[PDB]
Nucleic acid binder design. Structure first.
Ligand SMILES: [Mg+2]
Ligand SMILES: [Mg+2]
Ligand SMILES: [Mg+2]
Ligand SMILES: [Mg+2]
Ligand SMILES: [Mg+2]
Ligand SMILES: [Mg+2]
Ligand SMILES: [Mg+2]
Ligand SMILES: [Mg+2]
Ligand SMILES: [Mg+2]
Ligand SMILES: [Mg+2]
Ligand SMILES: [Mg+2]
Ligand SMILES: [Mg+2]
Ligand SMILES: [Mg+2]
Ligand SMILES: [Mg+2]
Ligand SMILES: [Mg+2]
Ligand SMILES: [Mg+2]
Ligand SMILES: [Mg+2]
Ligand SMILES: [Mg+2]
Ligand SMILES: [Mg+2]
Ligand SMILES: [Mg+2]
Ligand SMILES: [Mg+2]
Ligand SMILES: [Mg+2]
Ligand SMILES: [Mg+2]
Ligand SMILES: [Mg+2]
Ligand SMILES: [Mg+2]
Ligand SMILES: [Mg+2]
Ligand SMILES: [Mg+2]
Lengths: 90, 183, 336
RNA sequence: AGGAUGCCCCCUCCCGAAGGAAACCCCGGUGACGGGGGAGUACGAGGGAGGGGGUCCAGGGUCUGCCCUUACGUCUAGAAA
RNA sequence: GCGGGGGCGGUGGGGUAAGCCUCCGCUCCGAGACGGGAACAACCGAGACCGGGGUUAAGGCCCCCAAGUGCGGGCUUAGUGUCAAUCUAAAAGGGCGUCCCCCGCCCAAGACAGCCGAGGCGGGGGGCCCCGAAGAUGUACAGGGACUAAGCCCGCCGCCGAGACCCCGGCCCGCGGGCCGUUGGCCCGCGUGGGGUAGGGGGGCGCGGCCGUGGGGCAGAAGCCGGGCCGUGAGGUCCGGUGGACCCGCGGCCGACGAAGAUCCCGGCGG
RNA sequence: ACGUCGUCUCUUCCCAUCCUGGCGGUGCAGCAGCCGCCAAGGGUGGGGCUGCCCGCCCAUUAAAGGGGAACGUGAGAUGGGU
RNA sequence: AGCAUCUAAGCGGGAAGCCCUCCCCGAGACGAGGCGGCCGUUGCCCUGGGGGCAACCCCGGGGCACGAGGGCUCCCGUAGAA
């Protein structure tokens, strides 16, 4: 089963930003979540996304619900995932 | 050894033979992909193994009754061997018949395509003994398992409509289990 | 439908009524019997003729219990069977089919077997048995290949009949294999297989009657008030409705007889060693004399008067078995 | 009796109607996808020029594969009937 | 020609109803090719000179079958159902089966159910499904495979797809203009020009003879068998073989002038 | 120009079930009866009367159901009626 | 849905009906099957063409021999319209 949780690093599999990495920062409902690249980092804008269009990775950072990009970027440093985000899958 | 791969629907080879492991696949959805592959690659041979692990969605009683009606009520009053239907029951023959229904009818290209398909229950020993056996899956034809969903396997259907024949095949599996396990 | 209800004319369970593919019965079913020792599950014998016997009824609940009753009996001429080969069977894992995995032959088969088989001058039996042993652990069934010895029968022909008879009696496959191998090159007499008073099934090709009309073949009625009908009376009226057209269930003339049939639960009344005690002084009509062992069966048996008949242990025995004691045959009609 | 100054293949070159992409960069959308650039480009019916190689081409008989396809004449609103 | 027919509309009027009878109007079939509708004159799309390229229409895009196992939300558990009509179906009624909307009342934690502690009772309606739901050669028929979505509802994105529309080449036509001694021929321009039964109008091919004119033939006429070339075509012409004495081009004129069919006639000859 | 009633013969299909299998209700004590549901594998016969079909009747019977197949079947019969 | 409820998940029982068991046909079952065994897997002759000609080799046609197995002819009947 697919599990999407706040802080999880995910990969987008649909849309122009396909193959890019992103961080889940909020939950809208059972079907949509909010992800942020951060944009300056991986090229993913801060938008809602349907769960069907993302796949979870094995990496997770710790943040609060609705975390800002700077808070996300800082948490990406305490985990050392900065170069993990710039890599494009497939 | 057995190597499991995902079949690339755009990177099918034009020659040779691919082996598809049918376990966990929906029968009609896998048949649709298999039928298209055989027509679009007129030189490729397709082998389907584990045909008894194909899944038919729906209530078990509903699926079994559908098969019971097919093998019982569908008949001819003319010479039965010359003019009537001959309904398959075994999972490998059942699945091959399903693919036939998705191929062009009464033409050579439809006939040639079916002759390029082989379906097996479980994995034949000669395939197992190979140094490197590549088994493909077709994820779009795989069953997405959800709670409270009803489905049956072609093996359970066969057991329902031909118990003595299923028992012999089941016993054969037990008899050769040690040698199959060795290979 | 019909104007007045009545059952259909003849069975469609024997469709098609064609000539048997072989004059020798080919048995599809062999029962699983627990006898406590290994043994052949069947025997083959030649039908010699029919008589009648005075038998004491031994069924305690029967209304004729203890009385002498006259029963029609069939005499089988049963020279010993010669065991020529042992064959092993396994199950094909792909489909569960029973498949032969090998067989071991006697080194020096009798010269009469060469009338039917393409054999080498000598079989190297020890190698064949060695190869056979490799398949012991996947064996599910073992059968012997037996040849009849028609020279020892009243027919006197030389060409033998060859068929497979399984070994049963115990559930253990290994003991059945060991017993079957011990039989290679030896003969089997009817007393080695059956015991007097037991029930057997009989399988044979029935007597041939050639091309026959629909009245005899299916029992359709001769058209009533027979003289009234133009174009004959030994016929059906119509041969079908308008639709569906001639169906396969419509009675039609054709071959009658020479089919393989199975009859159940025939009691063995006596297994004799010397047929001179049962052969009538005139001989068996159209058969000859019996000089070796014979089997006396209660009732009738399918087949013409020289047909090879296969007896097997019953596959539909009744709930209550016959009495353990041998039946008392007081007198047979071929005697003084 | 037709062409053999042919036909076929390859390569190169020129022109080209209607129409006409892609990789990739940028903007939007959950997304299938849209838009700016790449680009009226690559290409595109056909029309011109040359070079290398081969041997028949057209036409015909018959068979196979794929696609299409409900004998004729007639009265009739209506014919495979 | 004075037999019409289909779709839709006038609750047309009649009739239990009818692929029913009888009016009124637009369109289509008859007399209209082609794409879709499973097949199918008249339902949808659309009007076809010939060849080729391109783009769309109706409709479709899991396989059969070209193009999506396309995107978001919700519903159904009955294989219900599976994108209008011809076309193979369903009613009154029952169901909190399940999803949802509204109203009235009780509970201010002393409500409902048998002290406990938080929601509870009733009414009205909507969606899908279940029962109501029974037939005769052969399977959950309504294209088949099969599908739990490849079903249904609210929306959305791209693509495929005709002879239509666009383009190129060729042809023909109507009308107008011009040239040539012309019972006719040729050239140019324009056309939101190019389907067609009955019928009307215009031109050509072939057969037998006649009036002229020009020729061929024993070094081989007509006829016949097979073949190449020319013409949209009727047909013309040439070649090889066979044959053995007549025949043809061009202009004009005339007919005992063209056959696939008549339970056609006569002869011959089949299964 | 599709041989016009019935019957005979012969085969198959439907189920809205008369009996046989299963179950329930009853104003079901028992013996019987009545009513509903599932179920079409098998059975549903012999005679009298009439050209019949239908129907009435007789003796039985577990019961002696009803329909479709070009009003199944006349290049199979019969030919009593029309 | 604090109770209750055969049902929503799960489980037990439950028909002459369905499937298997049983009988018949059966590998043209074109995925045309399994097993054991027997045989062949060779030569010579005549003639036409081609290559280099020095043998030679390749190809076309025919004939003969080897060879398991099969048939006709013969005497018959467990069989039978042929
Ligand atoms: Mg067959
Ligand atoms: Mg008569
Ligand atoms: Mg020339
Ligand atoms: Mg008419
Ligand atoms: Mg009419
Ligand atoms: Mg016509
Ligand atoms: Mg009129
Ligand atoms: Mg009208
Ligand atoms: Mg008309
Ligand atoms: Mg159509
Ligand atoms: Mg496709
Ligand atoms: Mg109504
Ligand atoms: Mg349905
Ligand atoms: Mg026109
Ligand atoms: Mg003239
Ligand atoms: Mg005509
Ligand atoms: Mg004539
Ligand atoms: Mg004749
Ligand atoms: Mg007629
Ligand atoms: Mg007729
Ligand atoms: Mg007639
Ligand atoms: Mg019923
Ligand atoms: Mg009739
Ligand atoms: Mg008649
Ligand atoms: Mg008739
Ligand atoms: Mg009369
Ligand atoms: Mg009269």
């Amino acid at each position: 089963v697919k599990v999407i949780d706040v802080g999880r690093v995910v990969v987008k599999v649909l849309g122009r930003e396909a193959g890019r990495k992103a961080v889940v920062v909020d939950i809208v409902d059972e079907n949509y979540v909010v992800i942020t690249g951060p944009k300056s980092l991986s090229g993913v804008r801060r938008r809602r996304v349907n769960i069907n269009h993302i796949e979870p990775t094995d990496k997770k950072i710790e943040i609060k619900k609705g975390a800002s990009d700077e808070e996300v970027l800082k948490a990406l440093e305490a985990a050392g995932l900065v170069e993990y985000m710039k890599e494009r899958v497939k | 050894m057995i190597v499991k791969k995902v079949l690339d629907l755009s990177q099918i080879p034009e020659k040779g033979e691919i082996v598809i492991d049918a376990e966990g696949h929906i029968m009609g959805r896998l048949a649709s992909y298999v039928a298209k592959i055989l027509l679009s690659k007129p030189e490729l041979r397709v082998v389907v193994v584990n045909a008894e692990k194909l899944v038919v969605t729906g209530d078990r009683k509903m699926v079994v009754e559908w098969f019971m009606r097919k093998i019982s009520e569908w008949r001819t009053h003319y010479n039965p061997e010359k003019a009537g239907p001959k309904i398959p029951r075994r999972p490998d023959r059942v699945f091959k018949r399903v693919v036939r229904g998705m191929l062009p009818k009464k033409v050579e290209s439809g006939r040639d395509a079916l002759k390029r398909l082989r379906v097996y229950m479980s994995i034949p020993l000669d395939f197992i003994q190979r140094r490197r056996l590549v088994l493909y899956e077709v994820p779009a034809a795989k069953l997405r398992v959800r709670p409270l969903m009803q489905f049956v396997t072609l093996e359970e259907v066969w057991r329902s409509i031909d118990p003595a024949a299923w028992e012999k095949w089941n016993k054969a599996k037990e008899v050769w289990a040690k040698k199959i396990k060795q290979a | 439908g019909l104007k007045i209800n009545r059952p259909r004319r003849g069975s469609m369970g024997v469709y098609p009524r064609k000539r048997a593919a072989d004059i020798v019965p080919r048995v599809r079913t062999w029962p699983e019997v627990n006898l406590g020792k290994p043994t052949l599950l069947g025997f083959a014998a030649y039908k010699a003729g029919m008589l009648h016997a005075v038998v004491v009824d031994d069924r305690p609940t029967s209304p004729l219990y203890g009385k002498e009753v006259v029963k029609a009996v069939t005499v089988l001429d049963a020279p010993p069977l010669y065991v020529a080969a042992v064959r092993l069977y396994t199950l094909d894992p792909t489909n569960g089919y029973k498949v032969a995995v090998g067989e071991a032959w006697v080194s020096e088969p009798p010269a009469d077997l060469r009338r039917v088989l393409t054999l080498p001058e000598k079989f190297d039996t020890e190698k064949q048995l060695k190869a056979l042993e490799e398949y012991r652990d996947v064996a599910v069934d073992v059968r012997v290949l037996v040849a009849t010895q028609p020279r020892l029968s009243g027919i006197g022909k030389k060409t033998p009949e060859v068929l497979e008879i399984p070994v049963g009696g115990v559930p253990s496959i290994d003991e059945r294999i060991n017993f079957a191998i011990s039989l290679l090159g030896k003969t089997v007499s009817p007393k080695d297989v059956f015991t007097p008073g037991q029930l057997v099934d009989v399988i044979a090709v029935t007597k041939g009657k050639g091309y026959q009309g629909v009245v005899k073949r299916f029992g359709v009625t001769i058209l009533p008030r027979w003289h009234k009908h133009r174009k004959g009376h030994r016929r059906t009226g119509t041969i079908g409705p308008q639709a569906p057209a001639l169906m396969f269930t419509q009675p039609r003339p054709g071959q009658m007889g020479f089919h393989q049939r199975t009859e159940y639960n025939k009691r063995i009344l006596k297994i004799g060693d010397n047929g001179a005690e049962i052969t009538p002084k005139s001989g068996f009509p159209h058969y000859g004399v019996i000089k070796g062992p014979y089997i006396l069966l209660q009732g009738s048996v399918p087949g013409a008067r020289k047909r090879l008949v296969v007896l097997r242990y019953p596959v539909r025995p009744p709930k209550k078995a016959p009495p353990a004691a041998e039946p008392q045959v007081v007198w047979v009609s071929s005697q003084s």
